[PDB]
């Protein structure tokens, strides 16, 4: 049996404070609780005795109808709470019509489900539990603040803030840390925050569990720099006395929910094992009158709070030496001049529980403005569930289909503000979805704590993230190659030819075509070649012209000798045009020449060769010549073949990834047969030459035929090799073919211009 | 409602001892002090002895001061008070009352109160 | 309000049993309890009274004490339990002594708290949650079952045993549902087994709930097609329901905890929708002396049931006709030959029921054995019973149950027990039953697998990725999850140390077929058997034969009365210069070996220089005449020029010394290649170059000179020739990649045109 | 435990009507059935009427078939018999019972049982 603290009425209505901490784990069985809370029990106690007695005095709520309470204590432990909660209901196997309270989200749900049997409203002022909104299963409840999904949706934005994604997790065993922790996980999933590892602790556990925690809690150090804590007041307590057992202090960072927001119970005597944590609090302003009534309270003239004595002499450490409650475990009296007003803080909740109480004034005062001797449950709820009135800071509370108020967020930061002096600073706030917190204050200059990461980002070159399975935040970056663009953040894919990855690693651009033969040296050489054998044809061709008479020329046939020039000027033409551009009308032209002007220049060597092998028969000496124009017809034939094989063409061609070219169509195999028939040709002429290569001649003609044909054979089996040789193949041909125009040229007609001369 | 009933007094002679013993009925008697008290016939009443609700505080008056005794058992609910050289002006009658909510000794007001018992002293 | 079954004794215990299903999602506020039950409901309460009847006449248990019951009803509901242990504590505020269930987790725990405040002891017989271990929190608490942490641990081993790696989840919602997957999901993230999603839902829920879960664990086909359900009966009977609405039957596999293990209640016209289940059961036999006092109760002769009456009716479908009780709906009458031997099933969990209220009993009797040794029944010590007492007397019991074996509960309050594994299946032409496949027991699983299967189609064990795990392929995780897989082809040049890596290797190594690392590459250097080097010896052998003939033929004709004009000793040493040239041609490509690679250099750098020095000297001699200092030794100094190239030679040793090394032009292949400076091989080739100009010069002032055997005018062929070999060899060095043949070609050509081109004309003079 | 009350019975002449009342205490009135009983002075007693514990069925005896009516309420927790066409050989004290665990009527084990009211019945 334990005291309880009642005022007489006629409407009683009932409470359950925690004026005691909860009973060791050594003695939970025993029921017996320990020591004595101020800003809870005190204060809460004190808060309702008079909220009630200024509600009736009051002549406007309730006139006529005098409020009378019963405030017991749950001794924040489920246990003690349901016994003093099954007092309540001893009646019913003056009433009561109400429960205010508790403040603990398992202990809120087994007073419940004692309670709702019976039809008894519950008006909770701190319990925030997300599972206790099931109107389903809690059907008498309701609270007058918000549930905690909103403080989860902070607690991620926050985290998102700042850029913190290896964050290691701690939550306290019971329905609070439970729900909580369950919500903050679901919504930091659907993102990149990756949780590093996730604890439980009971509240009550001894030092040797808070050593073990710690120890597990420091093996993620170096990287889980940050801890997110949605566990009660004496949870942060105990690791902060567990940090300093194991001499460890500002290695950690740990935000807080409103168990821990702006309470300096937790934070003291370790306030440098805790510097630098954020937490999140409801937002309430003080209450003024409350103050002016608590600070002149007196333990010799109270005589309705059964646990004021022992408070006093608690906070005081004194003993009152006559009192009926004298301890005699202090050494010390209590003096006269002692007062309430030193080292005053209110507790940060009162504006709840008296926004609670004035609920159930008003919800009475509505069912009444409708017989009534035996106070109806079930209407009292559907009269509570209606209510909408203004609270003690201005503000409308009203009720939604859940049974519970919209609120704010304050967000604190616990800091070092002069030399031992430390203090909690409003640095932010959350409100409907929308953070407005300020980074000036906190890590003032550029001190930011460093983000809780499992792995630095690889970007902007040809670098991979692979995923070894265990966490998706933890990689491993490898290179690609150089041909290789990032496709997706994981993969590298590799173009086609022709195409070269861009500097932004992001696609290939299908590099374009290099050609540049103008600028070349070698080219140029070839053209300065050609360009002097065109003007020593073009002289020789009018020294001819001039001399058309021919007094010694007509030997040989002046026909001849024009169709020899224009074989000249022909190869120099195509050595000029070989060049040219990849065009096909230029290749086709390039191709015609080839074929044209070294089997005319052997044909008419041929015919000139045979005009004197008949005599030591003839069918035309004169006509004979054109037979030979017949011949050279027959090597167009072989070109014509030439387009009945494959059309001209002009293709690029990749020797390299690196270096594409473009060339124009060159069969392998066709251009043999041309070269064999004017080989088959010289190898006639050579042999003709040498069968009369001795044979005398009026202007000694045999002797430099046989060394031509000897040095036009020996060049042409020099130049075979070379086509098959070097992989470009360019200009090995024109080279070849101006060098034997030249050779013809010279070793031709050098004897006429001697002669001439 | 706790409830108090007195046992002990009757008739002695001078230099002799007694006790008397005070019992509660009903719990929460560990949260009470305890106070015993005297009245002639036709005087006032006044205050003996008095004990805290957990006892180790105990005050006498003056009048009385080192021949009695206060002591309280919370087990068996009973509290005893030890009478040693009794007088003749002693014998009155003897209240038992639970103080709570009080001031120092004897501003104390007493929410319950006993039948009481009468103690003669005789020659 | 409820009623309430007793017989009077001088103690009384509790019970609360499920006699009636509880109530809709609709009527929970009101707490309407459904229809009645038989196996769950009303053969525990027959039960429980023959056994207290039994108890009081025995007279070693018990003697001289009767034993009374107040038997109420829980309902299944948490609500309904917690009022009617209301009514237990307040008739002590006779007595109740202990309580005997209730048997679900989360109604024994809202129970637990209202008893453990009044100090009374609670056994329970199905309530196998892992969290009623803790004696902190549950103090009064003994169950007569292990807790549900071997269950998980048998649902693993056969997950396990079938590697079915890829599952969905499924757990109704409550204490028991959520603690059993909990423990399940860290047991099989341990052992390596793989969760899709994971779901709950409530037993009373509607049908658009259950149609909604169907949907979400039909959008996971077909890679997972196993759920593990952890939940109760009417959740895997909503299941059924479910998948017959739909008409998706087939696709499944379902296992099964204690909730669903023979009650064949949950498959009854389902039955199509659930063959091949595979469910776990705690090991219990039939009571024999149960099924004879049950099957002769009749309703006009029990008078101690409350619920018997209805439940008559109930089961039977008809109106009992006169009877208090009537119910007058059902349209068919009563008839009087109705009995209970008819498809009678008994409770697959009554001889726990009966041990856990023989346990109560035999802890009264030791308490009653120490406080009053040697009185006959309740002495003044024993009165009124304390609970403390009791409970320590109950954590000390020790007996043998009706099944044979011993039960004594451990420090936790928990007993032993083994498991069996029960499949669904059909047997016939529509006739279904479950048949026992296995059992667990001490980590050890025993299971028939012919029995299960019988064929080759056990179903796909459930994957999310095929094995890519061959060696030339690596695998990808997407991101996911570590389950599923994308498998993509190593490189060519590639190996692998892990199954998800792909790393190449340095140049000349290729990696293995089994692509477990880069061991290296073959060279290749058995050049004899190519055509190319056969018809190159073939030419040297060749030119050797026609040098040795010349040389023979000069020897013998020494005397050389026409031959006078040439020096003898300068044509041998032409003729050695040759011969050298051929021995150099043959040995072009003798070996890599460093001493050939010398000999090459050497004999290269020499033999051509040497003979055509020789014949520069011969050119320049007959140059003099249209002064001289001595024709017969500037041969000597001839010699000395020969010397100079070979100094040039030993410049080419002080540059630097050649070696043989591995060259590799491209990863497929590697060559072995001997050392030749490119700007080393110059130097030789432009002495030998200005030589030929010199003597091309000489030649040309003298082309059209008489000569006796017309020396002067083969002199200008050789020149010319050997001009233009040079010049076309000149390029081929520079072109070709190899660049191992053609030099040889080249020299060994030039060589036999000086040959001829020299000395033809002697030959045919000779003849 | 359960208490009947009657009520309703008096002076009547013959061809009148009558109604007669029996109340229950208790809360679980509807888990019983209730039957309605006679005895005339100088004879035993003899069934006349029966209801089970929902309505719906109701069985009468064959001297009193036809004229005779019963009914319950569970909302009122209260039992009604309704008379007609009263006739000289209906007086007698009338009494109500409760069974709950009975065989066919009229076998039903009464096991609570009521004062009774006397009914005279002149010409
Ligand atoms: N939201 C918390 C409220 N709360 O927890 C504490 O430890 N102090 C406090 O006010 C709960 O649900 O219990
Ligand atoms: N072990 C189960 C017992 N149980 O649940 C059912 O649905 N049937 C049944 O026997 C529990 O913990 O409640």
């Known amino acids: ?757 | 409602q706790v409830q108090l009933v007195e046992s002990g007094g009757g008739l002695v002679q001078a230099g002799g001892s007694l006790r008397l013993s005070c019992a509660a009925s009903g719990r929460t008697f560990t949260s009470y002090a305890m106070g015993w008290f005297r009245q002639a016939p036709g005087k006032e009443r006044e205050s003996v002895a008095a004990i805290s609700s957990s006892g180790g505080s105990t005050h006498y008056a003056d009048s009385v001061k080192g021949r009695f005794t206060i002591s309280r058992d919370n087990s068996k609910n009973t509290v005893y008070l030890q009478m040693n050289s009794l007088k003749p002006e002693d014998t009155a009658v003897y209240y038992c009352a639970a103080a709570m909510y009080g001031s120092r000794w004897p501003d104390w007001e007493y929410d319950y109160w006993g039948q009481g018992t009468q103690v003669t002293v005789s020659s």
């Open chain 1, 1 to 757: 049996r334990r005291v309880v603290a009642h005022m007489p009425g006629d409407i009683i209505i009932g409470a359950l404070f925690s004026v005691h901490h909860q009973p060791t784990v050594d003695k939970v069985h025993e029921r017996k609780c320990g020591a004595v809370r101020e800003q809870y029990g005190i204060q809460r106690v004190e808060a309702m005795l008079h909220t009630l007695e200024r509600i009736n005095s009051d002549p406007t709520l309730l006139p006529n109808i005098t409020l009378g309470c019963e405030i017991r204590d749950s001794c924040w432990h489920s246990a003690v709470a349901l016994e003093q909660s099954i007092e309540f209901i001893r009646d019913s196997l003056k009433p009561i019509v109400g429960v205010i309270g508790p403040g603990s989200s398992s202990v809120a749900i087994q007073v419940q489900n004692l309670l709702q049997l019976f039809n008894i409203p519950q008006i909770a002022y701190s319990a925030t539990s997300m599972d206790l909104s099931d109107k389903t299963l809690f059907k008498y409840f309701m609270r007058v603040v918000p549930s905690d999904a909103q403080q989860a949706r902070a607690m991620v934005d926050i985290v998102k803030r700042y850029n913190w994604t290896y964050v290691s997790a701690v939550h306290t065993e019971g329905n609070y840390g439970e729900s909580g922790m369950e919500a903050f996980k679901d919504m930091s999933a659907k993102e990149g925050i990756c949780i590093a590892h996730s604890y439980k602790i009971y509240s009550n556990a001894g030092e040797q569990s808070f050593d073990k925690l710690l120890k597990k809690l420091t093996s993620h150090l170096p990287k889980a720099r940050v801890v997110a804590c949605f566990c009660e007041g004496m949870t942060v307590r105990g690791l902060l006395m567990a940090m300093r057992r194991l001499g460890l202090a500002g290695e950690f960072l740990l935000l807080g929910s409103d168990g821990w927001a702006d309470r300096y119970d937790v934070t003291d005597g370790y306030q440098r094992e805790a510097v630098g944590g954020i937490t999140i609090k409801l937002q309430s302003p003080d209450v003024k009158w409350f103050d002016d009534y608590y600070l002149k309270l007196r333990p010799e003239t109270n005589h309705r709070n059964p646990w004021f004595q022992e408070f006093w002499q608690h906070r005081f450490q004194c003993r009152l030496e006559g009192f009926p409650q004298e301890n005699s475990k202090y050494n010390k009296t209590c003096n006269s001049s002692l007062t309430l007003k030193t080292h005053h803080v209110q507790d940060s909740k009162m504006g709840f529980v008296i926004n609670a109480i004035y609920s159930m004034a008003y919800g009475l005062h509505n069912m009444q403005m409708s017989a009534m001797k035996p106070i109806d449950g079930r209407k009292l709820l559907e009269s509570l569930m209606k209510t909408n009135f203004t609270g003690v800071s201005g503000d409308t509370i009203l009720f939604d289909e859940n049974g519970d108020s919209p609120g704010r967020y304050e967000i604190m930061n616990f800091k070092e503000m002069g030399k031992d002096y430390f203090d909690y600073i409003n640095v932010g706030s959350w409100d409907n979805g929308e953070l407005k917190m300020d980074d000036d204050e906190v890590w003032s200059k550029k001190s930011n704590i460093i983000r809780s990461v499992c792995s630095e980002p690889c970007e902007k070159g040809q670098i991979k993230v692979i995923r070894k399975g265990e966490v998706s935040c933890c990689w491993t970056c490898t290179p690609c190659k150089e041909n290789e663009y990032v496709f997706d953040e994981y993969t590298c894919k590799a173009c086609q030819l022709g195409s070269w990855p861009t500097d932004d690693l992001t696609g290939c651009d299908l590099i374009p075509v290099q050609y540049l033969r103008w600028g070349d040296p070698e080219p140029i050489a070839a053209v300065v070649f050609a360009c002097l054998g065109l003007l020593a044809t073009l002289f020789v061709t009018v020294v001819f012209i001039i001399y058309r008479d021919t007094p010694v020329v007509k030997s040989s046939s002046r026909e001849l000798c024009y169709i020899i020039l224009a074989g000249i000027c022909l190869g120099y033409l195509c050595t000029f045009c070989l060049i040219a551009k990849p065009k096909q009308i230029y290749c086709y032209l390039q191709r015609i020449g080839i074929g044209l002007s070294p089997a005319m220049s052997y044909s008419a060597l041929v015919t000139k060769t045979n005009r004197i092998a008949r005599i030591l028969r003839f069918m035309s000496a004169c006509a004979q010549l054109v037979i030979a124009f017949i011949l050279i017809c027959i090597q167009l034939g072989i070109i014509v073949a030439l387009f009945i094989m494959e059309p001209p063409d002009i293709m690029h061609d990749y020797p390299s990834i690196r270096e594409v070219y473009l060339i124009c169509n060159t069969t392998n195999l066709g251009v043999v047969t041309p070269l064999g028939y004017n080989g088959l040709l010289i190898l006639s002429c050579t042999f003709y030459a040498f069968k009369t290569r001795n044979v005398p001649a009026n202007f000694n003609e045999a002797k430099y035929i046989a060394f031509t044909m000897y040095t036009t054979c020996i060049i042409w089996l020099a130049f075979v090799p070379i086509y098959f040789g070097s992989n470009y193949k360019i200009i090995t041909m024109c080279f070849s073919v101006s060098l034997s125009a030249t050779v013809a040229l010279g070793c031709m007609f050098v004897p006429k211009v001697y002669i001439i001369l």
